[PDB]
Design a protein around this ligand. Structure first.
Ligand SMILES: C[C@@H]1O[C@@H](O)[C@H](O)[C@H](OS(=O)(=O)O)[C@H]1O[C@@H]1O[C@H](C(=O)O)[C@@H](O[C@@H]2O[C@@H](C)[C@H](O[C@@H]3OC(C(=O)O)=C[C@H](O)[C@H]3O)[C@@H](OS(=O)(=O)O)[C@H]2O)[C@H](O)[C@H]1O
Ligand SMILES: [Ca+2]
Ligand SMILES: [Ca+2]
Length: 481
């Protein structure tokens, strides 16, 4: 109902993809030197992460040049008015798991943003908790002076004519740490190498634009059962970013908490507020949760997120946060009957959103850790608090999904089914999902990533096929809102 495909546009025939085998701790040191592209985590690296952004009549897309032998960082600008796709090839090539390019590293997406204030392009890429270390360190010195990888353009590059959309619009690293004339990777976003430690050991670049046109950016520090979210802001006036400031303290047990915890979720700018929603991973390994537990949520009344944080009830939040209890909504673990240590498994299936009408929505998924037990239990959960309601409605009458999106008066589930995009739609503040759209002909897709804007879903997709160089398409789906 109202949902329709506006355009499908091919971006390239050969974007990088890991067609090889799934290495592991024992074997990651013997990666196949043949044509196939082995990998350590997942196969996806193109059309993956924060890799698609609409700017005016353009859409910018980021990707890794295909061919296990190529792997170059790529940026393409698509002119939805003329149909032209102009692409810049950067010198940096995917460096793989812990710095060995023969092992595909699906964490190492290419995040993307374009400033509406000054038309600068911003790219953070190919990162997974890298630091300065030496030969005896886990990274064998492969990221010295290059553990945070930022590229960015002079002002106005976004709107430049097709002929001028070239690498020369981007700023070289000419600092004392520069690695040569093809060095386009900056170690910090502040333009001050003194901040470099502030940009160390980070993963997952993600950009948002404030309601006032300000670029926001956050990344993950750490992981497993000890992590933190860090965020900063783009100062267009001066063409540099602020330093990262934390949402929560790392090493919570040293900051007054009973235990360390990692975060599995996202910060999002929604309704003009920086917000966060996540499930934690406590370092406690004797309680009932093998991995994650809980659903947590908070928002900041400060335009930049520097303080004035509150939980869903408007209660002030200790900031930076130490104890996740302050912002706990509910416990998904309560929906499965097990209590023995590590018996409750929560990993996949979590996301959240807040509608323009201030409906708050969480989805998650809980199952028995032991898949073989006779009393195996598995549920998907949808927890939502309608705008003016007092308490959350929490139901297992829900099929499960990996993401939830919102636009206008609605929430959406969007993904691939048998290789073809579908859209499910429900009113904000309800559990009333219905399939309202399902592509049913054409080349099928392996995977993709979605960006919501303009009442449209921009579905940046990779086409199914063999090998490690596959085509990419952009679909612009009107959501009918
Ligand atoms: C991130 C940490 O990095 C260093 O600090 C350190 O290497 C540490 O590793 S450790 O040396 O083994 O202790 C790392 O800790 C891992 O962080 C991962 C992360 O991405 O944050 C965690 O992986 C996540 O959780 C896994 C359970 C999940 O694994 C999938 O699902 C399961 C399962 O549910 O039981 C089993 C399979 O192995 C796998 O499908 C991870 O998925 S992934 O596709 O493998 O990436 C991931 O979401 C990890 O658990 C931490 O040890
Ligand atoms: Ca550099
Ligand atoms: Ca535990």
């Amino acid at each position: 109902s109202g949902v329709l495909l506006e355009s499908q546009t091919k971006i390239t025939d050969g974007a990088l993809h890991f067609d090889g085998k799934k290495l592991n701790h024992n074997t990651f040191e013997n990666p196949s030197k043949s044509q196939a592209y082995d990998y350590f985590f997942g196969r996806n690296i193109s059309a993956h992460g924060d890799a698609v952004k609409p700017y005016k009549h353009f859409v910018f897309m980021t990707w890794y040049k295909g061919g296990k032998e190529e792997r170059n960082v790529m940026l393409s600008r698509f002119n939805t008015k003329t149909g032209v796709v102009k692409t810049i090839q950067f010198p940096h090539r995917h460096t793989g798991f812990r710095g060995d390019p023969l092992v595909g590293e699906s964490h190492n997406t290419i995040g993307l943003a374009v400033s509406p204030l000054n038309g600068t392009i911003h790219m953070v890429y190919d990162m997974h908790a890298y630091v300065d270390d030496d030969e005896t360190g886990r990274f064998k010195g492969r990221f010295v002076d290059d553990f945070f990888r930022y590229s960015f353009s002079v002002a106005g590059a976004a709107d430049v004519p097709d002929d001028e959309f070239t690498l020369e619009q981007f700023v070289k690293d000419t600092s004392e740490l520069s690695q040569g004339a093809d060095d386009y990777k900056h170690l910090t976003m502040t333009g001050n190498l003194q901040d470099k430690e502030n940009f160390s050991a980070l993963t997952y670049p993600k950009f948002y634009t404030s309601d006032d046109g300000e670029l926001l950016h956050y990344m993950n520090w750490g992981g497993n059962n000890n992590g933190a979210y860090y965020f900063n802001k783009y100062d267009a006036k001066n063409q540099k970013w602020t330093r990262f400031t934390p949402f929560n303290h790392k090493d919570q047990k040293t900051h007054g908490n009973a235990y360390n915890w990692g975060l599995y979720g996202q910060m999002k700018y929604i309704n003009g507020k920086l917000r966060v929603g996540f499930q934690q991973r406590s370092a406690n390994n004797d309680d009932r949760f093998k991995y994650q537990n809980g659903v947590y949520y908070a928002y900041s009344d400060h335009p930049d997120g520097l303080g004035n944080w509150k939980n869903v009830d408007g209660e002030d939040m200790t900031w930076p946060l130490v104890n996740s209890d302050e912002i706990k909504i509910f416990e998904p673990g309560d929906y499965i009957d097990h209590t023995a240590p590590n018996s409750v498994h929560i990993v996949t299936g979590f996301d959240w959103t807040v509608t323009e009408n201030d409906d708050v929505h969480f989805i998650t998924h809980v199952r028995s850790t032991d898949t073989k037990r006779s009393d195996y239990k598995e549920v998907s959960i949808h927890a939502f608090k309608p705008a003016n309601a007092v308490d959350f409605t929490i139901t297992t009458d829900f099929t499960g999904a990996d993401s939830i999106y919102t636009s206008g008066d609605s929430i959406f589930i969007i993904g691939l089914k048998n290789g073809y995009p579908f859209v499910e739609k429900a009113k904000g503040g309800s559990n009333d999902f219905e399939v309202v759209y399902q592509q049913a002909s054409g080349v099928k897709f392996d995977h993709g990533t979605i960006h919501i804007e303009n009442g449209k879903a921009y579905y940046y997709l990779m086409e199914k096929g063999a090998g490690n160089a596959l085509p990419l398409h952009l679909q612009v789906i009107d959501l009918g809102v």
